[PDB]
C-alpha cells in the first residue's frame, strides 16, 4: 500500500499562526487562548544579535510596541513577558480557532510535523525528527522564525518545537514552547557547531519493518545477531546503541511481521557492512531514520 | 537553509472532507458548495468490483441510500448523479468551510499534495508527483478512496486528484475531479499493469539547482553537453527527453545560480553514467524527481 514521509494534517495549527512585529523585525507567533508565543529575538535588530542582553532590550519595549496581526485583524496586546527564549504576549481576545493543545518537550529520535510560515502565513508542511544532537534538518528561510513543530493525537495538538535559528552548517535549532532550546544552542549570532549526529537505530529498524510490510524484502537474510554484537556494528557506523527499551517498542512490528527484532538487526548489520549494492528500500537508497515505530504502526494501520 | 519534500498546508482541504457510506461500503467524499464528490465504486460490494455495471448498480440506489457525514453532522442528500468515475451528491447545505477552488487536470511530472483520509477524517499529508505513466506512489490503505490531491495558489485550492485504486504492484491510480482516470486505468478489479515509469528529467535538474542553492555542489563539473547529446544519455537511463520548453522553465534557476542549463545537464549526465560514488545530494542517495522548477523557486523564496 506504500510508505511516505507523512506529516500530520496542519489545519489546527494554521488557525494559530499570527505575524508578530517589533520595530523593524517581523516573525511568526503562535496564538493559543489569549497568549501569543514567539521567539524573543523579535525585539532584536541584526546589530543586537551579535551579543544581545534580552532583559535590557525588552525593558525599552511596551505592550504597544508588539504588533500582532492574525490574518488581517490586529490583536490588542495587554501584557508581555519573557519565559526563557520565548516572549508571551497577552492579548485581549482568545483565539476562537484554538485547538485542544499541550506543550511537550520531545526526546531526540522522536518525530514531528513542521508548519513553515512567513509573515504569519503558512507555506508548507513536512515531517522532521529531533536529531540525537538536538538539531533538525528542516527548510527555513529568514522570516520563518516562530514556525512550530507538533504532533496530533485524535483532536489534541502537542506543540514541541518553535524555530529560532539556522546554524552556519545549514541545520536548524529551536526551543520547546516554554522557550528552552533543544541542545546547547543560545539565541546569539555566534559560532555554534552541532555535535556528532548519529543515526536513530530504532527508527531505521522500524522503517525496515515498514519495508517488509509493503513488499520490500530483498534485505532479509538467514542470520541473527545479539544486542552486544549489533551494537559493536552500530558504534562503528555512528548509529545509536540499541537497548532492550528499543527492542520492546519494536514488539508490535515484530509481532505483525513474524520477524524477531534481533533477526531484523542482522539484516541492518549486513546493510551497514555491505551497503545497498545499488538497490533501494521504499524508494530510498539510504537507510531512513526519521520514522519512529509509532509512525510506522500509525501509517500502516490508518489512524486518523 | 535546507530542502524538504514539502506539502501545502492542508487546512482548506480538511474542512471539505466527509464520510460517504452506501450500503456496506464507506469511503471519503469532498464537500464543496452543495455537492459531495466521491469515487463511484462506493455503490459496489467487493463482489461487484470484478466486473461492475455502474449504471445498473446506481439504478438500484436512491438519494436516501447515500449517507454523508461531515464530522458528526448528517448531510441531507437531494440529488445524485454519476460523472465519469465519480458520483456527485447534491446536498441541501453548502459547506461553510468551502475554500476558493478549481478543478484541474494536471500533467504528468507535475506535483501535488495528498491529504490521506479514512472515514472522512484526515490522517496525514504528503507531496506526490503524477508519474509519466499516470500512477502515483502514495500511501493508501482500504478506506482511503476519495482522498484528494491538490495545489494551492494564495487562497485558491486547485483539486487535481481523487484516489480510487491500488494496482497489484502497490502503486496508485485515480481520477481528476470530473471522474476521468489519469492513464488507462478502469475502476474494476482486473489486472492493470502500469506501463514503464520514466524519471522526470526537468524535475531532477530543478532539484540539482536546489542542491546548489543550499550548498551541495560536489556534483558540479567542468563539462557541458547539448540537448541531443544529453537525450541520448536520458534514453539509456529511462529519463524523459529534455526539450527547449524544459530548458525555458529552468531559466529562473539558471539565472539565480549562474549555472547554464546545459552545464547542469552535463552534471546529470555524469551522475547517470558514474552514479553518486557513495555520496548524497540534499540528504538523498538517488536522483530526486518529485520537485518541479516551480516547487524549487517557491520553497527557496518563501512563497506563502
Ligand atoms: C536566516 C534564518 C534562516 C533560517 N532560520 C532562521 C534564520 N534566522 C536566524 O538564524 C537569525 C534570526 C539570523 C538568528 C541568528 C542568531 C541567533 C538566532 Cl536565535 C537567530
Ligand atoms: C485496498 C485499497 C488500498 C489502497 N487504495 C485503494 C484500495 N482499494 C481498491 O483498490 C479497491 C476498492 C479494492 C478497488 C479495486 C478495483 C478497482 C478500484 Cl477503482 C478499487
A159 beta partners: A103, A150
- Choose among A222, A43, A25: nearest CA to A143: A25
Helical segments of chain A, H only: 11-14, 54-59, 201-213, 227-236, 244-249, 251-257, 261-274, 293-301
Q: Best substitution site from A50, A141, A165 to test ligand 1's pocket, by max atoms within 8 Å of Cβ? A: A165
Rounded to whole angstroms, how far apart are CA atoms B143 and A30?
34
Residues from chain A that touch B137, judged by Cβ atoms under 8 A, are 2, 283
User: Does residue A9 sit in the same domain as residue A108?
Assistant: yes
Domain boundary among A197, A223, A257: A197
Q: Is there a single domain that holds both residue A122 and residue A140?
A: yes
**Interacting residues of A58 by C-beta distance below 8 A, sequence separation 6+:** A40, A43, A80, A82, A87
Considering the domain architecture, whether residues A135 and A243 belong to the same structural domain is answered as no
Query: How far is Cα A256 from Cα A300, in angstroms, rounded to an integer?
Result: 11
Residue A163 burial (CB < 10 Å; 0-12/13-18/19+)? buried
Answer yes or no: A145 catalytic.
Answer: yes
Cα–chain center distance at B169: 18
My answer on whether A271 and A202 are in the same domain is: yes
Nearest-angstrom CA–CA distance, B96 and B115: 20
Domain boundary, last residue among A161, A178, A197: A197
Whole-number Å distance between alpha carbons of B301 and A153 = 32
Q: Ligand 1, atom 5: nearest CA belongs to which residue?
A: A166
Looking from the CA of A122 toward its CB, the CA atoms found within 13 Å total 26
- CA of residue A75 relative to chain centroid, distance: 28
- CA A18 to chain CA centroid, nearest Å: 20
Query: Does B143 share its domain with B271?
Result: no
The last residue of a domain, from among B46, B75, B99: B99
Q: Give the C-alpha separation, A207 to A111, whole Å.
A: 13
Asked if B297 reaches chain A (Cβ–Cβ under 8 Å), the answer is no
Q: Is A253 helix (H, G, I), strand (E, B) or coil?
A: helix
| A31 Cβ contact list (under 8 Å, min separation 6) | A16, A17, A18, A37, A68, A70, A75, A91, A95, A98
- Rounded CA separation A221/A166 (Å): 42
Q: Are residues A126 and A1 in the same domain?
A: yes
3-state secondary structure of A188: coil
Which of the residues B125, B138, B169, B287 would you substitute to probe the A interface, choosing the one with the greatest number of A C-beta atoms within 10 Å? B125
B124 near A CB under 8 A: yes
A227 shares its domain with A191? no
Sign of the Cα torsion A87, A92, A96, A100 reads: positive
Find residue A117's DSSP bridge partners.
A122
CA B69 to chain centre: 26
CA distance A165 to A180: 13
d(CA A217, CA A257) in angstroms, rounded, equals 11
Residues B104 and B192 in one domain: yes
Work out how many domains chain B is built from and give that number.
Answer: 3
Q: Is the CB of B164 under 6 A from ligand 2?
A: yes
B278 touches chain A (CB under 8 A): yes
Would you call A60 helix, strand, or coil by DSSP? Answer: coil
Name chain B contacts of A6, Cβ cutoff 8 Å.
Answer: 116, 123-126, 139
CA angle A273/B283/B220 to nearest 5° reads 105
Dmax (CA) for chain B in angstroms is 69
Pairing status of strand A86-91 against strand A148-153: unpaired
- Is A41 catalytic? The answer is yes
* Shortest alpha-carbon distance between residue B30 and chain A (Å): 16
**Residue A227, CA distances (Å) to A197, A232, A263, A265, B115 in order:** 21, 9, 11, 8, 39
- Grid cell at residue B51: 466486473
Annotated catalytic residue: which of A41, A164, A172, A246? A41
Angle, CA A15 vertex, CA A12 and CA A17 arms, to 5°:
115
CA distance B53 to chain A (A): 26
Task: Note whether B135 and B9 are same-domain residues.
Answer: yes
Resolution in Å, one decimal, please. 1.7
Determine which of B3, B5, B7, B157 to mutate to test the interface with A (most A C-beta atoms within 10 Å).
B7
Task: Please give the interface size between A and B, counted as residue pairs whose CB atoms are below 8 Å apart.
Answer: 145
Are A213 and A174 members of one domain? no
Q: How many Å apart are CA A207 and CA A252, to the nearest integer?
A: 13
Whether residue A5 is found in the same domain as residue A104: yes
Contact assessment for residue A220 and residue A270, using Cβ atoms and an 8 Å cutoff? no
DSSP per-residue codes, chain B: -----PBPP-HHHHTTEEEEEETTEEEEEEEETTEEEEEGGGG--TTGGGS--HHHHHHT--GGGEEEEETTEEEPEEEEEEETTEEEEEESS--TT--EEEE--PPTT-EEEEEEEETTEEEEEEEEE--TTS-B-----TT-TT-EEEEEETTEEEEEEEEEEE-TTS-EEEE-TTSPBSSS--SSSS--------B-HHHHHHHHHHHHHTT--TT--S----HHHHHHHHHHTTBPPP-HHHHHHTHHHHHHH---HHHHHHHHHHHHHH--TT--BTTBSS---S--HHHHHHHHHT--
CATH of the domain at B277: 1.10.1840.10
Q: Measured between alpha carbons, how far is A222 from A49 in angstroms, rounded to an integer?
A: 57
Give the closest residue to A7 by CA, choosing from B5, B129, B71.
B5
What's the rounded Cα separation, in Å, for the pair B234 and B254?
A: 20
b vs e for A191-225, b when ≥16 Cβ sit within 10 Å of the residue's Cβ?
ebebeeebbbbbbbbbbbbbbbbbebeebbeeeeb
Task: List all residues 6 or more positions away from B130 whose beta carbon is below 8 Å from its beta carbon.
Answer: B106, B107, B108, B109, B110, B111, B112, B136, B160, B161, B182
Q: How far is the CA of A95 from the centre of ligand 1 (A)?
A: 28
Is there a contact between A227 and A241 (Cβ–Cβ < 8 Å)? Answer: no
A156-166 and A100-103 strand pairing: parallel
The burial of B191, by beta-carbon neighbours within 10 Å (0-12 exposed, 13-18 middle, 19 or more buried), is given as: exposed
Q: Is B83 exposed, middle or buried (0-12, 13-18, 19+ CB in 10 A)?
A: middle
Range of the domain at A264: 198-301
B 128-187: CB under 8 A from A: 137-141, 143-144, 166, 170-172
- Based on the fold, state whether residues A151 and A3 are members of the same structural domain: yes
Nearest residue, CB atoms, A123 vs list B138, B214, B302: B302
In this structure, the residue with its CA closest to atom 11 of ligand 1 is A165
CATH label of the domain that carries residue B25: 2.40.10.10
- Helix (H) or strand (E) holding A74, with range, is strand A73-75
Q: CA-to-CA distance for B225 and A266, rounded, in angstroms?
A: 45
DSSP annotation of A181:
B
Catalytically annotated residue among A128, A145, A160, A265:
A145
Distance of CA A128 to the CA centre of its chain: 5
Of all protein residues, the one whose alpha carbon is nearest to atom 15 of ligand 2 is B189
Pocket of ligand 1 (CB under 6 A): A 41, 49, 140-142, 144-145, 164-166, 187-189; B 1
**What are B31's three cell numbers?**
464537500
Distance CA A75, CA A114 (A): 25
> In sequence order, which residues have a C-beta less than 8 Å from that of residue B246 and are 6 or more positions away?
B201, B202, B205
Amino acid at each position: 500500500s506504500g510508505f511516505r514521509k507523512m506529516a500530520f494534517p496542519s489545519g489546527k495549527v494554521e488557525g494559530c499562526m499570527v505575524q508578530v512585529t517589533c520595530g523593524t523585525t517581523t516573525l511568526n507567533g503562535l496564538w493559543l487562548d489569549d497568549v501569543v508565543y514567539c521567539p524573543r529575538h523579535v525585539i532584536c535588530t541584526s546589530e543586537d544579535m551579535l551579543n544581545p542582553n534580552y532583559e535590557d532590550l525588552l525593558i525599552r519595549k511596551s505592550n504597544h510596541n508588539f504588533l500582532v496581526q492574525a490574518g488581517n485583524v490586529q490583536l490588542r496586546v495587554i501584557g508581555h513577558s519573557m519565559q526563557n527564549c520565548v516572549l508571551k504576549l497577552k492579548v485581549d481576545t482568545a483565539n476562537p480557532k484554538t485547538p485542544k493543545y499541550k506543550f511537550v518537550r520531545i526526546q531526540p529520535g522522536q518525530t514531528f510535523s513542521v508548519l513553515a510560515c512567513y509573515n504569519g502565513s503558512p507555506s508548507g508542511v513536512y515531517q522532521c525528527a529531533m536529531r540525537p544532537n538536538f538539531t533538525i534538518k528542516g527548510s527555513f528561510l529568514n522570516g520563518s522564525c516562530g514556525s512550530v513543530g507538533f504532533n496530533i493525537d485524535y483532536d489534541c495538538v502537542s506543540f514541541c518545537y518553535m524555530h529560532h535559528m539556522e546554524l552556519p552548517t545549514g541545520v536548524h535549532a529551536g526551543t520547546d514552547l516554554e522557550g528552552n532550546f533543544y541542545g546547547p544552542f543560545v539565541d546569539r549570532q555566534t559560532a555554534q557547531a552541532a555535535g556528532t549526529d548519529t543515526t536513530i537505530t530504532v527508527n531505521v529498524l522500524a522503517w525496515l519493518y515498514a519495508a517488509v510490510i509493503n513488499g520490500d524484502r530483498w534485505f532479509l537474510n538467514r542470520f541473527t545477531t545479539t544486542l552486544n554484537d549489533f551494537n559493536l556494528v552500530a558504534m562503528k557506523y555512528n548509529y545509536e546503541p540499541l537497548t532492550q527499551d528499543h527492542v520492546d517498542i519494536l514488539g508490535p512490528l515484530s509481532a505483525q511481521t513474524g520477524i524477531a527484532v534481533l533477526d531484523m538487526c542482522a539484516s541492518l548489520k549486513e546493510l551497514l557492512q555491505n551497503g545497498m549494492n545499488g538497490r533501494t528500500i521504499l524508494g530510498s537508497a539510504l537507510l531512513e531514520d526519521e520514522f519512529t515505530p509509532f509512525d510506522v504502526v500509525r501509517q500502516c494501520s490508518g489512524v486518523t
